[PDB]
């Protein structure tokens, strides 16, 4: 199954920078969402969920087709809460109806990471909306109540290795869980992209507790939390080495995250030899906007 990237007709870097800027200005404007976290973290989660349905074995799922817009995927229990990100992006899509759904959802993630002071994430256009019957079934996204072996095996389906996995999970520096979405009680939350997830793992005094949904999670007296799958990164000796690496080298984490996140967003997509090079968007701050 082959999905060839096809650039939205006549569009170039400047067009996509305008879309980035619109997303970024709305991120700045709608600052009260989720107890003043803003929509940054949920847009990153959205980009990950629309991409994380991919299966390397048959090239089903993935970001290309924009299939999150269809009821089956929209209503996946694993996607509970992402409706907020979708609604956030609706007026952006109305202003720029020429952008494909997959391009918009993925660009939303890139914009959010960068605007939250994360690394630059090169981004490529050309995802094309596919029909409703191409929507992957529910159940392709990972469970949080599992161990390191589960995480490792799960991510093999997305063609991600140990480093890639550990880097990607660093996104859990952003935002929080919500008991009503996922059955996990949210802890201390930030909207700035840093390597603090790894520092938290290594430095806090974690206690295994049960939350009000009767699920186990790791909580600190400082008020932080970790999912069981988060904590598995320090239970497994291979993951632990990498956690320590990123806790001790901000720049290395940023570079590795950028590569892994672009890869995640591009899984399943064949880029023609004469496709445009990846775009690196300027932040609002860099533009003086
Ligand atoms: C084993 C893999 C993963 C599991 C089990 C997992 C699980 C979860 C859960 C349960 C939540 C809470 C959702 C809610 O209650 O609203 C969450 C939130 C989040 N996830 Fe993950 N996740 C995983 C990997 C990732 C990856 C790879 C990324 C991106 C690179 C990511 C980005 C985020 C972000 C940014 C949030 C915060 C959303 C918000 O604040 O609304 N996650 N994750
Ligand atoms: N470990 C966390 N604090 C976390 C943050 C956001 N999403 C999931 C987990």
From TrEMBL:
EC number: 1.11.1.-
Cleaved signal peptide residues: none
Residue span(s) of domain Plant heme peroxidase family profile: 99-289
GO cellular component terms listed in the entry, alphabetical order: mitochondrial intermembrane space; mitochondrial matrix
Family: Belongs to the peroxidase family. Cytochrome c peroxidase subfamily.
Primary role: Destroys radicals which are normally produced within the cells and which are toxic to biological systems.
Name this protein carries in UniProt: Peroxidase
Native source species: Saccharomyces cerevisiae (strain RM11-1a)
Parent-protein start and end of this portion: 72 to 362 of 362
């Amino acid at each position: 199954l082959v999905h060839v990237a096809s650039v939205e007709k006549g569009r170039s870097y400047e067009d996509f920078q305008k879309v980035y800027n619109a997303i970024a200005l709305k991120l700045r404007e709608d600052d009260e969402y989720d107890n003043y976290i803003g929509y940054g973290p949920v847009l990153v989660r959205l980009a990950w969920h629309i991409s994380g349905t991919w299966d390397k074995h048959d090239n089903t799922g993935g970001s290309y087709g924009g299939t999150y817009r269809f009821k089956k995927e929209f209503n996946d229990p694993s996607n509970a809460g992402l409706q907020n990100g979708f609604k956030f992006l609706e007026p952006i899509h109305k202003e720029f109806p020429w952008i494909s759904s997959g391009d918009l959802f993925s660009l939303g993630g890139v914009t959010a990471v960068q605007e939250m002071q994360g690394p630059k994430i090169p981004w490529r256009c050309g995802r094309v909306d596919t029909p409703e019957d191409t929507t992957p079934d529910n159940g392709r996204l990972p469970d949080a109540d599992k161990d390191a072996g589960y995480v490792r095996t799960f991510f093999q389906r997305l063609n991600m290795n140990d480093r890639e996995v550990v880097a990607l999970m660093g996104a859990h520096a952003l935002g929080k869980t919500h008991l009503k979405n996922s059955g996990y009680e949210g802890g201390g939350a930030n909207n700035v992209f840093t390597n603090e997830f790894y520092l938290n793992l290594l430095n806090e005094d974690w206690k295994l507790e049960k939350n009000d949904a009767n699920n186990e999670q790791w909580d600190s007296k400082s008020g932080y939390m970790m999912l069981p799958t988060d904590y598995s990164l320090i239970q497994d000796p291979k993951y632990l080495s990498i956690v320590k690496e990123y806790a001790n080298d901000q720049d290395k984490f940023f570079k590795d995250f950028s590569k892994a996140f672009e890869k995640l967003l591009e899984n399943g997509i064949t880029f023609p030899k004469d496709a445009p090079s990846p775009f690196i968007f300027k932040t609002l701050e860099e533009q003086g906007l």
